[PDB]
Design a protein around this ligand. Sequence first.
Ligand SMILES: Cc1c(N2CC[C@@H]([C@H](C)N)C2)c(F)cc2c(=O)n(N)c(=O)n(C3CC3)c12
Ligand SMILES: Cc1c(N2CC[C@@H]([C@H](C)N)C2)c(F)cc2c(=O)n(N)c(=O)n(C3CC3)c12
Ligand SMILES: [Mg+2]
Ligand SMILES: [Mg+2]
Ligand SMILES: [Mg+2]
Ligand SMILES: [Mg+2]
Lengths: 708, 690
Amino acid sequence: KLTPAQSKNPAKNELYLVEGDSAGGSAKQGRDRKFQAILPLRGKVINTAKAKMADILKNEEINTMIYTIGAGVGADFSIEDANYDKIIIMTDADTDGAHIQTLLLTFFYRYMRPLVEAGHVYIALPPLYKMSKGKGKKEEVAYAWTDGELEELRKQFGKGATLQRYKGLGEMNADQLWETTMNPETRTLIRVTIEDLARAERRVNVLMGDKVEPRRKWIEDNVKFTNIQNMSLEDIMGERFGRYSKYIIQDRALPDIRDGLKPVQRRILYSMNKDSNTFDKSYRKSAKSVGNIMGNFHPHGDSSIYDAMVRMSQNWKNREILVEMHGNNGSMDGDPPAAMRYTEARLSEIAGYLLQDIEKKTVPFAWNFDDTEKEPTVLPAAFPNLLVNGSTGISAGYATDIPPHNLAEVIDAAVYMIDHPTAKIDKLMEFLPGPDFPTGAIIQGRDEIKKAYETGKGRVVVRSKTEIEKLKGGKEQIVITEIPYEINKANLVKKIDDVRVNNKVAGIAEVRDESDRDGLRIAIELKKDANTELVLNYLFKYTDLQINYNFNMVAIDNFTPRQVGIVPILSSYIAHRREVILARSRFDKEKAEKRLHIVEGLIRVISILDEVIALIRASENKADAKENLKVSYDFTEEQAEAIVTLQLYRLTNTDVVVLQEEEAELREKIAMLAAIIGDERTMYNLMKKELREVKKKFATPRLSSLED
Amino acid sequence: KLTPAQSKNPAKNELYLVEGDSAGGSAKQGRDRKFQAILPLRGKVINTAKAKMADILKNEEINTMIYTIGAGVGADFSIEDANYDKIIIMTDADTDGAHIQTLLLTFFYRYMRPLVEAGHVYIALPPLYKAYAWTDGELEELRKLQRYKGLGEMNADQLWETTMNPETRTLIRVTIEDLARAERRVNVLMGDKVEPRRKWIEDNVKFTNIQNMSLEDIMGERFGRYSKYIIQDRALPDIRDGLKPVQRRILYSMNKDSNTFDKSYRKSAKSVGNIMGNFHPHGDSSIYDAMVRMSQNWKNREILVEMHGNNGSMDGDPPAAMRYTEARLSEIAGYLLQDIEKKTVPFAWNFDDTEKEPTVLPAAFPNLLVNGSTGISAGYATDIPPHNLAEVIDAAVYMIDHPTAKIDKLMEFLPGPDFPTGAIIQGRDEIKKAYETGKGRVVVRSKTEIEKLKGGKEQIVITEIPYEINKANLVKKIDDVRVNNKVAGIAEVRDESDRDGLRIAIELKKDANTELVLNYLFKYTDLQINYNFNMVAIDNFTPRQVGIVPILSSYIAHRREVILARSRFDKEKAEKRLHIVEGLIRVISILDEVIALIRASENKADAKENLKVSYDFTEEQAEAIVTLQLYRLTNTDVVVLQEEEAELREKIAMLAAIIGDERTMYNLMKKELREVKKKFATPRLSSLED
DNA sequence: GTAATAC
DNA sequence: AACCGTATTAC
DNA sequence: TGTGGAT
DNA sequence: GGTTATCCACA
Ligand SMILES: Cc1c(N2CC[C@@H]([C@H](C)N)C2)c(F)cc2c(=O)n(N)c(=O)n(C3CC3)c12
Ligand SMILES: Cc1c(N2CC[C@@H]([C@H](C)N)C2)c(F)cc2c(=O)n(N)c(=O)n(C3CC3)c12
Ligand SMILES: [Mg+2]
Ligand SMILES: [Mg+2]
Ligand SMILES: [Mg+2]
Ligand SMILES: [Mg+2]
């Protein structure tokens, strides 16, 4: 696990804790082996301020750090016996690296304080940028850390340099690594020093401790959701965890309150759609989709991307699947989906509707990490995806659980709230009565559903749909045909058979999964004279045949986390749809005005065709022809360009009644569009009309039944 | 590992051997659990005709078959006490599936013969097309299409309907028709001896509800299918451009995507998925590992891919995964693709039938020798070491001018291999031998030097090591020598290699026979090795053992083909244009009546027809005329056009001559070869001796 | 025992 | 992101 | 425990 | 291609 330096020298030797085996590799190659050791950290590092000292001892990483520094841990820690003068934390300069620096520091604090107090623990800063320039053989390069340092490089170099924005240590060669972050004579470091032992204890415990409330409050109060230098432990931990917190809150774990997507989902959709990988066209190798995503939009592991893509495709997790996938995309038994090298995929037809009108400038775009392509920050959302498909849900200081809903019900609620902005929950619940899990079952708790629909939190009960079949020999048989959302069929069955094997309740002959490609069925065969209600009851209480589902509805509203209920959600959707439909209408109106202008021009041209040809023949060149067109006949620039760039064959379709029809069509179109832009009510009707069109086209029956 | 049926019944119960854990998944999901069990075979199954009965017994996949079937193995096999009525092998309808069946069958012919003789072994044929078709013949009737690349693209519902359901499935039943003609077929195709296999392949492989098939037949079609493919479309290089198909697809795909030496690097994963989705229907690991090799300058003499990040090291440590790295084509790679846009090379459809791909690249330098190739197919394998680009080109140029040249003269320009890792190559006569027959055994030995140290001690210092040798294992193997005192005098071993140099120090003890030691290490560690030429390439769709002459000849032939093709293409462009310009020049002389005629016309179609009829314009001219933008009518400069007419004519003459005169053509070829040499030449690294 | 495309 | 097994040839 | 984007 | 550990919140 450890790559030891060549010669033991407690006075010079350095220990590099590197983020990941891959960068560990590069660093093994780039090091100076006389005095630098490498010790890769394979994945996120254990929070030694949250976990049991037991699990902490059993930890592969912690154990090998205690034993290569060779000074023991805890109160039995002797600085004098250490094997390194410098410990150096070298992570990507990304938010997850920020997180790792945090975790490692809270270990060196808790269990090796003397090393931190003696200023022996540093943090290496990899560069953020590399500027051009050249071409292949004759190509030069320089590095920068501050957007300011970058501005100064642009002064030199000049044109035509090109910036490479480093996304993490993985895109550096060993030669580049050494020169910029490992060479003692070249590198910028940070020395963690403790300035105030007191102020540093509270800082570490708030952020890294087991208690959630404090941390939530620390984040609410500090995070603004809108050579060698010293940093304090308090100040560093503050700044690094602040970055991670903000990031996984607004850009990883929680869905946007308008389209109900996490950023990775939005990118999966946007990418596949750009590439015309749509419901009406041939499937397409998953790996091809995943790589395009990873290359154009989402700078994270393929497995995160693929796994997300997969989930949006499983109809027992999504109420209305957004991706269709050919092949083994898993099962309710929780077995593993085929690797992205085996499967093909495309957008579902309904996904199309989440994306409807995206070409029409209806939604804010941001630059991507390459600064090479724009991507959308929210989708146009032609149905209220947050409630229909749900979300879940773990961040920092916040987590989220929102159950799926029946498309027709959600839309009915919305259409009501559109006519009646001030509607109370009691009334919306006549349209939207409760969750509809794609897996069906029975949902119990009208009261707790209101609580949740009102506060974002609530606890409801989900219970399996059962039936009793009689068998020959006078013996009964419990048959289960629907089970509760998010429950693994295979385990459930094992856990029930466990009840039989342990004879927890009397009367169980045999458990058998009898589910086949078209239908779920767990048969529980009872004995001769078993109290059949006694069994069913015990199984509800002591296995997941029946569970508690907990609403924790948190979404991102105006850039910040928000515990929210049916009303903040529905109105947020409505508000959003409003911005879009207006944007859309502005777009189409401008496009129609421009055309109308040309068409007006062509209509005049036709009546003076001969004069115009003569006049163009008479000009010297393109520009000259346009000026003569303007001056002699008062056409505008935009018309003149249009006229002068018609191809010759056009002087045959010299037909003005058909152009006049287009003119009329356009005036009428423009009138319709203007009315939408100019009157809230006309526009909300357009919204209601479209929402109804989607319900007609996609509605399906409830699956889950309701009881209180 | 096994998914067993619900009820035990040796009358109905079926055992499904599914290629892949992944399809094993679909299988488990799609079956009828009351009587169908699932055993996924996870990867290529062991050859039970080559391996020892030692390793055959320790085998994971073999064991669990001998234990799930529960009848015992080999001679202690009682069919009576079995567990299934039908053992059903179910793989991709691809070449590797074919191979897999082949390996299973040889297991069931060798260690459970009774089972195959009583016809309990079957072969599930999955559909080729989507309604579903199996024959390219049935597809004609169904067409009054998704072409399936494997079981993996199939939903569990579809699996059941097409190939698992006893009512809808099309099976093949394995039968032994001639117990002896069958022993020979299996022994020949799957046994230890290669020569009988090679011969079998040369004589048979033409490189151009329930039916019963013989074991001699099934193994014939199956192994021939895999053989041919593995020989043509995997392991061996095209003699012309030196690429194996995965490599050619890696380059063509990245090139198509503008991922070139002069442009910023793309994420390795994006490139790889593009290759996988567009051209190469195999696993990403293969594709990426290939991409990575082409980027390592201690394996290629002239790297075709530039990769940012951890792409491995001479110490043999794993390259970062494709999610970490980025890449682009190297400048020289550009030259392999030069002129591809010009119809200079044969294209074929891809599997998807969406895109055409090239079957050989233009190859402006002779890649096969420069970079070399290795090398393991069926009945054949290949090793061809890298050479120095200036030297290869010098040879080719001499040969262009002297087609019937002898190896001896050619070796004045191409003295022998030039390994990217340098070192010392010993053996001129074996080099000659290899250049003559494509087989040869030379010696490759490390660049050494002796540093004197304080205290009357000497130090042996390594600076280059043999091609294909792992630095780290070497350094370890030398140290073992020290630690076990096999030979005497080693004080310490130190790898002192840094980011910009290779250096291994062997410190010796006071008064230790430094030659004795150095000889010992040469013989007993890879400090010195024997490299073996076995130059096999693909010429005319078939494997050919070849030396320096057919290689150079084939390259020259190829270049001739490309240059001619290229020259036809440019000439046709120049002519299509000359023709139009003649048309315009005319039009200007009679501008007024043409505008009139178009004016009179009743639409584009009628206008073109009127131009042709009234003024003898051709279609192509008419088209051009009639799609001019109005502002064109402003110009009446016939002189600028006439200058273009002249330039096109000079151009056409020069091109025609290349097509019409062999000497002209070959001069061009030489001119271009020399430019490439001038641009990319670098000095020898490996020294020569005999 | 390796090498490098495949599973 | 490493680890694990196997086919194929040849020395 | 287990959930799903992350390393 | 499965397995193996972690973060983070909340029952
Ligand atoms: C399964 C399998 C292995 N193993 C490890 C154990 C062995 C068992 C004995 N079949 C299979 C193995 F050790 C390596 C791979 C592999 O590298 N790549 N790229 C793969 O795609 N697979 C899958 C076969 C396709 C691998
Ligand atoms: C390393 C590591 C693991 N392990 C198992 C042991 C453990 C110890 C803590 N290093 C690391 C592990 F068990 C699973 C993964 C993983 O699924 N995916 N997708 C990954 O990319 N990695 C790498 C971390 C990024 C994994
Ligand atoms: Mg990173
Ligand atoms: Mg329960
Ligand atoms: Mg296959
Ligand atoms: Mg040797």
